[PDB]
């Protein structure tokens, strides 16, 4: 959120057709998108991310 | 008669009552078809049904959960091509409301 | 949250009243109280609303003996708050039995204001250590909210008194008060009088008014410990968040501080970042080594630079951190402040958990066993012999801060997965 | 491009757009979630639209 | 409906006569009777039409030794009514013993303007407990009206004597009294003398005029407690209508008050709701909670900000309310009074049940306790052995009141579904 902030606020603040404002909300998203862990080839890595988060909820017991 | 039968049957599966002439599965028998005789529902609403099964594939897309999704969506399609359809599906949505979840590894 | 500030001591009272001042600076207020109609930011970080655009501030002001908090009373900086909590020997002896007495009707005055707040996050100490009438009073008065709230956090600002040299009770006071501050304090914010006695010989050729100026010095360093509240940042907008990486463990709670000018009469982030790295820009002065290090920018923003300078102090290796634990040394970034004129726009903050503070613990704790073993020193008064017959208290805090040493110097090792 | 970024204000559902779905002031959400802990801690059997569109609007 | 207000007792004659001559001033019409031609509005609610643009008040006053009496006979608001009703110890059987035998002509006063009035809905009582003449000839007078009146309501403003400290019977005045105020009234009224000194105290610095003030505030809620009848307004412009939720039990039928300023030498309505909850805005001084809470509003109206409010002081969670019940603080908004200049244009106003007046009850009651088992106190005159030669009336009133206690502690309880 701080590269990719700058990224859409310049290709907004810019933009000179409304298309542009569009096509620059839609990279910035899925930038973000591939940024995290929501991809379909990127499951791998979240899976081990869901049983890091499990044993903080089990250490609380 | 094959419908006696099958509650029987019912009894003996969900309750684990193997032996009919165990009182305790006369009992669960009675009360099983005493309820199928208390009508107190209304009829199965089809188009509720459908809503309710497009809200679960949004979930299932909401979480990142694709391949969940995507079977989700192909299995409900499939099975809704040849009444009883939206019958089944609200009993199995209403048997485990619980959470349900996870569920993976298709 | 919101946090109740309590200052006491003649020197607690003065950076009570200084950090309170330089609020009223920061933000876009009256020193009456008023706020100003050309004002975004938060102005209700530590303050209760009045009317008159009124942000009274949140802070009680405790007073022994007093001499200073009548030139602290004639002042407009009185008229921001003084919801009427003035209330009324240089042991900690005098301090402890005198707050002994009265401990009531001044946990009454911060009842008064619990109920008054609606939301809470902790209290914080405005401490002098070995000043006579706060030592003892801040100790009791310590215990005292630990034993009334296991629900609140404490932090408390503190002095190490050492002017390399008259009071001869210094390490007994410095002991016991330390003793209640490793076992009955949540965090602790310490500080070299020496270091700033240092930096203050450094940046001009004073010697007698280094008072106002080491006032300049704190000023700084505590806003900038503020700054990520009181202007809304993302993460450590509560004190818990900035608090919990920085403790591995509370019998490790003792906190570092710096400032990245030397003098205060483009620049990258690495560069502030790799001297706050530098011990002769560090304000508090085998090898030691951090236990975690977090540090806060606030100024001009590189965005991606960040990231850039972060490989670049890595591949430096200027700092080596714990063997045994994944400590690493960690970024902040705050929005510079508005309302007021500023020389260096950027500016830097450490926050960490180093061993070299162990040093001047047995240096007090040598000098204690050689004045306690010359026996002319505690000064015999009947606030010690009513305190203690025996005097073995002071024996069993130095029992418990020599073990707190073992405990630095186990910690100290690449092995401390074992106790002690 | 003029009258949508005023009259329909664009930038400003931005800038919201970026504070509270992407957390983007931080506080606002954390005050949120530190109030809203008794709830989520309840099972959800028990828990009604009321109670959260309530709870909401003292935070804001 | 039409209510005549009834007064007796010295301070009781003067809170008519305070409230009369408010409602002079509220109400476009002259002291000498004559209503103004410079003015909508009811001038109706409890006043004769005479002609000349005479609404003669109707309004009974009752005396008995009379000092004060003559003080108040001597005005300009005495030219407003007095259809000629005057007619003439500091014991309740004095006062009772006193109203035995003059009842009937009094009584003849009564159903003079009861044939007078064509329409009623109740009557008035302002009365003052332990006021020596007051008591005991207005618990007679209040169980003659009951008696021959079970069709009409009655509502008695009385104080409640609590100055802090000689006269010593005045808990078995108060024992009495109570005794038929619980079994012989339809709605009490009640105020602290010790509350309106310590908010006298508050807004002021006074002691020695403080009954003048009290007369301000106690008009101030009179006057409130009556404009939504007196002003057209929509619900609760009947005394029924007002009364019959603050009630859910006629055990539970004492009534508390309220006044949104503390010192009366944009606001919304949240702020005076949500402070109109706090007890030291509350004009009356385990956990206490109420039983049902109406408030009414009287200024500045903005029209969708009332439900947001009301979103908002449920999410305050400030008050829970009785648990085996739906209990709900309501709201009612009325017109601000024309005819006066007035300051504070928001006004705010708390009929509520709560059960923190069963403590000033057994206070009473301990201090009864106290005095009939010491034994000197009852002062042993002619009125009390004629009046009984056994003295267990009072024992009986003294059961009656501790049963009184035990329904309140039990309705304290989350079990009020079974009796006691």
């Not at chain 2, 099958?6 to 009919?20: M, N, S, T």
């Not at chain 3, 606030?383 to 110097?409: A, C, G, P």
Request: aromatic residues 8%; proline residues 4%; contains cysteine.
């Amino acid at each position: 959120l701080e590269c990719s902030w700058d990224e859409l606020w310049n290709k907004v603040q810019q933009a000179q057709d409304l298309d542009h404002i569009i096509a620059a909300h839609e990279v910035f998203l899925d930038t973000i998108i591939s940024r995290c862990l929501l991809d379909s080839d990127s499951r791998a890595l979240l899976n081990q991310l869901r049983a890091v988060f499990d044993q903080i909820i089990e250490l609380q017991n | 008669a094959q419908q006696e039968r099958d509650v029987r049957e019912l009894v003996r599966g969900v309750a684990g009552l193997q032996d009919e002439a165990d009182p305790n599965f006369q009992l669960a028998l009675n009360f099983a078809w005493s309820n199928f005789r208390f009508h107190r529902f209304l009829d199965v609403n089809s188009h509720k049904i459908e809503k309710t099964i497009e809200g679960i594939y949004e979930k299932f897309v909401i979480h990142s959960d694709l391949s969940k999704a995507a079977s989700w969506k192909r299995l409900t399609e499939e099975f809704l091509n040849a009444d009883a359809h939206y019958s089944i599906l609200s009993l199995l949505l209403c048997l485990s409301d619980s959470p349900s979840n996870s569920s993976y590894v298709e | 949250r919101e946090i109740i500030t309590l200052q006491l001591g003649q020197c607690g009272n003065q950076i009570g009243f200084e950090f309170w001042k330089q609020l009223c600076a920061e933000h876009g207020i009256s020193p009456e109280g008023i706020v100003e109609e050309f004002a975004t930011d938060r102005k209700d970080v530590f303050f209760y609303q009045a009317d008159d655009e009124h942000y009274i501030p949140r802070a009680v002001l405790l007073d022994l003996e007093p001499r200073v908090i009548h030139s602290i009373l004639n002042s407009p900086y009185a008229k921001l708050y003084n919801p009427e909590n003035i209330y009324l020997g240089n042991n900690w002896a005098s301090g402890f039995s005198q707050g002994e007495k009265i401990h009531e009707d001044i946990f009454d005055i911060i009842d008064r204001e619990a109920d008054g707040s609606d939301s809470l996050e902790g209290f914080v100490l405005c401490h002098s250590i070995a000043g006579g009438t706060g030592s003892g009073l801040g100790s009791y008065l310590l215990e005292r909210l630990n034993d009334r709230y296991p629900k609140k956090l404490v932090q408390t600002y503190s002095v190490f008194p050492n002017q390399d040299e008259d009071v001869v009770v210094q390490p007994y006071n410095s002991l016991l008060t330390l003793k209640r501050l490793t076992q009955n304090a949540d965090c602790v914010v310490v500080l070299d009088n020496t270091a700033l006695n240092r930096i203050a010989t450094d940046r001009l050729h004073i010697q007698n008014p280094s008072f106002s100026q080491i006032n300049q010095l704190v000023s700084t360093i505590m806003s900038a410990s503020t700054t990520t509240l009181r202007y809304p940042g993302y993460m450590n907008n509560d004190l818990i968040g900035l608090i919990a990486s920085l403790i591995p463990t509370p019998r490790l709670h003792f906190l570092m501080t710096g400032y990245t000018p030397l003098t205060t009469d483009k620049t990258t982030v690495l560069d502030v970042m790799r001297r706050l790295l530098q011990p002769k820009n560090v304000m508090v002065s085998t090898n030691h080594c951090y236990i975690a290090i977090l540090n806060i920018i606030q100024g001009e923003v590189d965005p991606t630079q960040v990231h850039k300078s972060l490989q670049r102090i890595r591949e430096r290796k200027l700092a080596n951190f714990i063997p045994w634990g994944p400590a690493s040394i960690q970024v902040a970034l705050s929005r510079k402040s508005p309302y007021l004129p500023s020389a260096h726009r950027v500016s830097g903050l450490m926050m960490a958990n180093h061993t070299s503070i162990s040093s001047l613990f047995e240096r007090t704790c040598r000098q204690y066993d050689k004045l306690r073993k010359r026996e002319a020193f505690l000064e015999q008064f009947r606030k010690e012999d009513m305190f203690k017959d025996n005097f073995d208290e002071m024996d069993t805090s130095r029992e418990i801060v020599q073990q707190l040493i073992d405990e630095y110097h186990a910690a100290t090792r690449p092995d401390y997965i074992s106790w002690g | 491009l003029d009258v949508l970024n005023k009259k329909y204000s664009l930038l400003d559902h931005m800038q919201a757009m970026r504070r509270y779905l992407l957390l983007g002031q931080g506080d606002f959400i954390r005050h949120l979630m530190d109030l809203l802990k008794p709830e989520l801690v309840r099972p959800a059997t028990t828990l009604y639209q009321h109670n959260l569109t309530g709870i909401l609007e003292t935070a804001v």
